[PDB]
């Protein structure tokens, strides 16, 4: 086996494995080299045959089309937000309230 490098664009790549479908649960997905975190939901959008994935105003990935099936999948990240505590003075009481 002889290898030549730094001379031509790479086209003989190794084998890449694949996983199973997921729905309504955010995961650290990877679609054709595009990585990210978000849920996988059914999309009502319409694409063109040369389009791979979509984008929005905020320069973020929004819709990803899997190569296995022609139907497209939307991308929405996990439910993120701050957490706040609602408490009285420690000299008065001890109980606390959790605010999301």
């Amino acid at each position: 086996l002889s290898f030549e490098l730094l001379h031509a664009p790479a086209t003989v790549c190794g084998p890449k494995k694949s996983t199973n479908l997921v729905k309504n649960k955010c995961v650290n997905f990877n679609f054709n080299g595009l990585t990210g975190t978000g849920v996988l939901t059914e999309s009502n959008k319409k694409f063109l045959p040369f389009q791979q994935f979509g984008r929005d105003i905020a320069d973020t990935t929004d819709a990803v089309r899997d190569p296995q099936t022609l139907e497209i999948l939307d991308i929405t990240p996990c439910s993120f937000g701050g957490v706040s505590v609602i408490t009285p003075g420690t000299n008065t009481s001890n109980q606390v309230a959790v605010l999301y």
């Binding site: 973020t60 990240p77 993120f80």
Partner: peptide, 22 residues
Amino acid sequence: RSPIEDLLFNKVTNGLTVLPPL
């Protein structure tokens, strides 16, 4: 609401979270 303030309201139209006003 008054008609004037309602008309004014109708005329006026990651990791980032926008807190709602009190």
